[PDB]
Amino acid sequence: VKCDENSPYRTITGDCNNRRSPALGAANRALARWLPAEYEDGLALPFGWTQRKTRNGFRVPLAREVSNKIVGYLDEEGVLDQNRSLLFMQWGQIVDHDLDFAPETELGSNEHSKTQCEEYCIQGDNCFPIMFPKNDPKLKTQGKCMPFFRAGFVCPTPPYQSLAREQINAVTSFLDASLVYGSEPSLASRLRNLSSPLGLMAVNQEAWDHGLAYLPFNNKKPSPCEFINTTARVPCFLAGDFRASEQILLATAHTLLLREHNRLARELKKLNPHWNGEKLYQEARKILGAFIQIITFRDYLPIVLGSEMQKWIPPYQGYNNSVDPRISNVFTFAFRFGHMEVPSTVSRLDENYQPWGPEAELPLHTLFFNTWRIIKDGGIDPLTRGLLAKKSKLMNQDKMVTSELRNKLFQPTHKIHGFDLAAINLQRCRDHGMPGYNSWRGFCGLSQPKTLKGLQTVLKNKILAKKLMDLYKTPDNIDIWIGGNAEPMVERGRVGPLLACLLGRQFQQIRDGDRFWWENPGVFTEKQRDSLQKFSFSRLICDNTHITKVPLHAFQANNYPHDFVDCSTVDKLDLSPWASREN
Ligand SMILES: *[C@@H]1O[C@H](CO)[C@@H](O[C@@H]2O[C@H](CO)[C@@H](O[C@@H]3O[C@H](CO)[C@@H](O[C@H]4O[C@H](CO)[C@@H](O)[C@H](O)[C@@H]4O)[C@H](O)[C@@H]3O)[C@H](O)[C@H]2NC(C)=O)[C@H](O)[C@H]1NC(C)=O
Ligand code: HEM
Ligand SMILES: *[C@@H]1O[C@H](CO)[C@@H](O[C@@H]2O[C@H](CO)[C@@H](O[C@H]3O[C@H](CO)[C@@H](O)[C@H](O)[C@@H]3O)[C@H](O)[C@H]2NC(C)=O)[C@H](O)[C@H]1NC(C)=O
Numbered sequence: 068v069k070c071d072e073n074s075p076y077r078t079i080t081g082d083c084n085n086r087r088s089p090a091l092g093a094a095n096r097a098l099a100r101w102l103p104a105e106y107e108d109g110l111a112l113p114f115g116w117t118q119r120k121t122r123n124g125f126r127v128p129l130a131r132e133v134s135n136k137i138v139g140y141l142d143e144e145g146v147l148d149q150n151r152s153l154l155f156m157q158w159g160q161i162v163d164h165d166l167d168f169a170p171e172t173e174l175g176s177n178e179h180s181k182t183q184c185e186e187y188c189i190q191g192d193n194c195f196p197i198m199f200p201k202n203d204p205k206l207k208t209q210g211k212c213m214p215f216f217r218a219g220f221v222c223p224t225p226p227y228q229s230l231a232r233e234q235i236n237a238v239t240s241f242l243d244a245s246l247v248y249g250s251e252p253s254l255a256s257r258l259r260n261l262s263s264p265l266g267l268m269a270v271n272q273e274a275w276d277h278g279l280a281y282l283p284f285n286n287k288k289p290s291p292c293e294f295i296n297t298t299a300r301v302p303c304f305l306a307g308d309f310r311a312s313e314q315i316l317l318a319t320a321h322t323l324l325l326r327e328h329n330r331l332a333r334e335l336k337k338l339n340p341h342w343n344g345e346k347l348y349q350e351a352r353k354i355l356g357a358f359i360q361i362i363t364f365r366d367y368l369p370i371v372l373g374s375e376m377q378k379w380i381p382p383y384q385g386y387n388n389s390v391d392p393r394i395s396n397v398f399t400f401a402f403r404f405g406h407m408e409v410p411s412t413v414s415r416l417d418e419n420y421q422p423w424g425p426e427a428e429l430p431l432h433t434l435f436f437n438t439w440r441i442i443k444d445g446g447i448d449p450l451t452r453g454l455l456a457k458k459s460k461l462m463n464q465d466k467m468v469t470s471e472l473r474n475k476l477f478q479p480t481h482k483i484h485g486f487d488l489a490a491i492n493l494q495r496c497r498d499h500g501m502p503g504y505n506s507w508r509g510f511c512g513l514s515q516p517k518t519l520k521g522l523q524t525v526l527k528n529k530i531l532a533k534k535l536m537d538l539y540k541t542p543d544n545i546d547i548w549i550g551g552n553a554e555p556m557v558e559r560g561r562v563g564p565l566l567a568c569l570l571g572r573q574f575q576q577i578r579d580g581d582r583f584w585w586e587n588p589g590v591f592t593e594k595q596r597d598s599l600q601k602f603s604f605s606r607l608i609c610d611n612t613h614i615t616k617v618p619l620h621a622f623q624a625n626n627y628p629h630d631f632v633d634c635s636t637v638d639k640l641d642l643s644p645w646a647s648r649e650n
C-alpha cells in the first residue's frame with residue numbers, strides 16, 4: 068500500500084523491495100512466466116481436459132497412470148541416501164514454502180460443488196478430477212477418481228474470460244522467512260504477542276515442551292488435525308504459512324524457528340533495554356531472515372546443485388535492481404524434486420539416539436496433519452534427533468516416490484489417506500499450463516530428444532525411456548515434473564541438468580534482485596555480518612531444544628556418536644554487534 072522509502076525493514080507483503088517497481092516480488096501477485104503458457108484452448112483449459120483434443124497429435128496420458136507405471140515401487144530397502152540426512156529433505160520443504168504457494172480455488176464453504184467433484188467426479192469449471200485408469204486397485208476401494216481443483220488465478224476467481232490464465236503466489240518471492248511471520252498484514256499481526264512490549268511471537272497457552280514453546284493452536288474448526296484422531300482432539304498449529312502442519316517433521320522445524328525468534332527478541336531486550344516492541348520484532352525478524360538465506364545458500368544449495376552451482380549462481384556482486392525477483396510458475400514444479408527424497412518412515416530417538424519406545428518408527432502416512440504425536444507423545448526433541456541421525460531418500464529412477472505419498476496422502480479437505488501426490492503434481496503441471504519437457508530443455512540450452520533412442524541417451528536408461536514413450540508417444544509431451552526428475556543426477560548434486568538450470572536461475576535471481584539480501588552493503592554492518600557468518604542449523608538446535616550432541620554439518624549423513632560433538636564445540640551467534648549506544 069505505502070512504501071516507507073527509508074525503512075530498514077522489509078514489509079510483510081513483500082512490496083517496496085524494489086523502488087522503481089514496488090509490487091515486484093510481493094505476495095498475492097501472479098507467478099512469473101519464463102515461457103508462454105500452454106493451454107488446450109490456448110487461454111485457460113489444461114491439456115487432458117477435453118478428451119478428443121490431442122497435444123502435438125497425441126492424447127496426454129492419465130496422471131494416475133504415469134504414476135502407476137513410472138513413479139511407484141514396492142521394495143523400500145536400499146532406498147536411503149547414503150550421504151544426506153533427513154534434514155536435507157526437510158530444509159528444502161521450508162525454503163519452498165518460503166518462496167511459493169498456489170492456493171486452490173475457493174468459492175467453497177456451503178457449496179455442493181466440493182461434493183459434486185468428490186462424489187460424482189464430474190469434470191467442470193474448477194473440478195479437474197484425476198480419473199483412475201483400468202486395473203487400478205483404487206477403483207475397487209475408493210471410487211473412480213481423486214478430486215482435484217484448479218489453482219487460483221489473478222484478476223478474478225469467478226468464471227472470467229480475458230487473457231491467458233495466470234496462477235497466484237500467495238507468498239513473498241524473497242527468501243525472507245515469510246513462512247514464520249506470514250505474508251499478509253492481518254495474519255502477521257495475529258501471530259504476534261501484542262500484549263507485551265517485548266516483541267515476541269505468540270505461543271501455546273495450553274501446552275509446553277519442557278518449558279519451551281509450541282506454536283499457537285489454530286482457532287478455526289473443522290481442523291484436519293483433530294480429524295486424524297477424534298479422541299486426542301488436538302488442532303493444527305497457527306503459523307506464517309498455512310501448510311505448517313502438513314506433516315509432523317515440518318511442524319517441528321516450524322517450532323524451532325518460532326523459538327529462535329523469541330529467543331533473539333529477549334536476548335536483544337537485554338542488550339538494548341530501550342528498544343520498543345516493534346523494534347524488537349523487526350530486528351529479530353531481520354536476523355531470522357538472514358539465517359534462512361545463509362543456511363540455504365551456503366549449506367543447502369551447494370549440495371543440491373553440485374558441480375553446477377557456480378555455473379548458475381556465481382559469486383555475489385551486489386544488488387541489481389534490473390533483476391526480476393519473482394518466482395516463476397515453473398520453479399514451483401522444479402522444486403518438487405524434493406517429493407522424491409521423502410522416505411517411508413519417521414523415527415523418534417532418545418537421548419543416546421536409540422529407538423524411542425515401542426512405536427519409535429512410524430509410517431509416513433500416519434503423520435500427515437498429525438499434531439498429537441508432538442504434543443501428547445514426547446515433544447519435538449525426539450523428532451529433531453531423527454532429522455539428524457536418519458537419512459533422506461535417494462531419488463532412484465526405478466524408485467521415485469514412496470507409496471506413503473503415492474497412495475496414502477491425506478488431503479486436509481477430504482477424509483481419506485488415499486491420494487497420490489505424484490498424480491497431483493502431474494495434474495498440476497497441466498493445470499498451470501506448463502510447456503512440455505523439450506520446451507524446457509531448449510530454454511536451458513540442452514539437447515531436445517525426439518526419438519526413443521534419443522531419450523535413452525539423455526536419461527541413460529533404456530527401460531524408463533521406453534515406458535515414458537509408450538505413455539507420452541513424444542518427448543515433447545512429457546510433463547516437466549516427471550521429465551526433469553527422471554534425468555540422472557549431476558556430479559555431487561541431487562538433480563539433473565535441466566533441474567539444476569531451473570533451480571539455479573531462480574535462486575540467483577531472488578538473491579540478486581533482493582534489496583535486503585544480507586550481504587547487500589548497508590543492510591547489516593560488517594561486524595553484524597561477521598557474526599551472522601557463524602549461524603548454523605546445528606546451533607539453532609543447541610539453543611532451542613534440550614539436545615546436547617549434534618553434528619557440525621547437519622545436512623550430510625552423520626553417524627552417532629562418532630560424528631556428533633557437544634554443543635559447546637559449536638559456534639554461537641554473537642549478538643554484541645547489535646548493541647546500540649545513546650549519546
Ligand atoms: C543487472 O542485471 C541485468 C538484467 O539481467 C543485466 O543486463 C544485461 O546487460 C547486458 C549488457 O551489459 C545485455 O546484453 C549483453 O550485451 C551484449 C550486447 O551489447 C550481448 O552481446 C552481443 O549481442 C549479440 C548477441 O545476442 C552479438 O551479435 C553482439 O555482437 C554482442 O556482442 C551480450 O550477449 C549480452 O546480451 C543483457 O541483455 C542484459 N541482460 C538481460 C537479458 O536482461 C546486467 O548485466 C546487470 N547489471 C549490472 C551492471 O550488474
Ligand atoms: C507431504 C509432503 C512432503 C513431505 C512429507 C513434501 C515435501 C517437499 C519437499 C521436501 C520439497 C522440496 C525440497 C517440496 C516442494 C514442493 N511441494 Fe511438497 N511435500 C508434501 C506435500 C505437498 C502438497 C500436498 C503439495 C501441493 C501439490 C499441488 O499441486 O496441489 C505440495 C507442493 C509442493 C510445491 C509447490 C507450491 C505452490 O506453489 O503452491 C513445492 C515447491 N507438496 N515438497
Ligand atoms: C489417538 O491419540 C491418543 C492419545 O491422544 C492415543 O492414545 C494413547 O495410546 C497410547 C498407546 O496406544 C497410550 O500410551 C501408553 O499409556 C500408558 C502409559 O501412560 C501405558 O500403560 C500404555 O500401555 C500405553 O502404551 C496413551 O496413554 C493413550 N492416550 C490416551 C489417554 O488415550 C491413541 O493411540 C490414538 N489413536 C489413534 C487412532 O491414532
Ligand SMILES: *[C@@H]1O[C@H](CO)[C@@H](O[C@@H]2O[C@H](CO)[C@@H](O)[C@H](O)[C@H]2NC(C)=O)[C@H](O)[C@H]1NC(C)=O
Pocket residue numbers: 150370620623624
Ligand atoms: C558427503 O557429503 C559431503 C557434502 O556433500 C561431502 O563433503 C564435502 O566435500 C567437498 C569436496 O568437494 C568439500 O569441499 C566440503 O568441505 C565437504 N563438506 C564438508 C563441510 O566437509 C562428503 O565428501 C560426502 N561423503 C561422500 C562419501 O561423498
Ligand SMILES: *[C@@H]1O[C@H](CO)[C@@H](O[C@@H]2O[C@H](CO)[C@@H](O)[C@H](O)[C@H]2NC(C)=O)[C@H](O)[C@H]1NC(C)=O
Pocket residue numbers: 260262263265267268269270271272
Ligand atoms: C506474551 O508475552 C508475555 C511475556 O511478557 C507472556 O506472559 C508470560 O507468560 C508466561 C508463560 O505463560 C508466564 O510465566 C509469565 O507469568 C507471563 N509474564 C507476564 C509478565 O505476563 C504471555 O503469555 C504471552 N502471550 C502469548 C499469547 O504468547
Ligand SMILES: [Ca+2]
Pocket residue numbers: 165166238239240241242243244245246
Ligand atoms: Ca518469502
